[PDB]
Amino acid sequence: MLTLKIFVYTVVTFFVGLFIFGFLSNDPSRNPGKG
Partner 1 sequence: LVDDRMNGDGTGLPFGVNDGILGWVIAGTLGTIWAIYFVSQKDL
Ligand X SMILES: CCCCCCCCCCCCCCCCCC(=O)OC[C@H](CO[C@@H]1O[C@H](CO)[C@H](O)[C@H](O)[C@H]1O)OC(=O)CCCCCCCCCCCCCCCCC
User: By rule CB under 8 A, what count of residues binds partner 1?
Assistant: 13
Angle, CA 26 vertex, CA 10 and CA 9 arms, to 5°: 10
Q: For residues 2-26, b (16+ Cβ closer than 10 Å) or e, as one string?
A: eeeeeeeeeeeeeeeeeeeeeeeee
- Is residue 16 a contact residue for ligand X (CB under 6 A)? yes
Query: What residue 8 binds from partner 1, ligand X, none (CB within 5 to 8 A, per partner kind)?
Result: none
Instruction: State the minimum distance, in angstroms, from the CB of residue 8 to partner 1.
Output: 10
Interacting residue ranges for partner 1, rule: CB under 8 A: 1-2, 5-6, 9-10, 13-14, 17-18, 21, 24-25
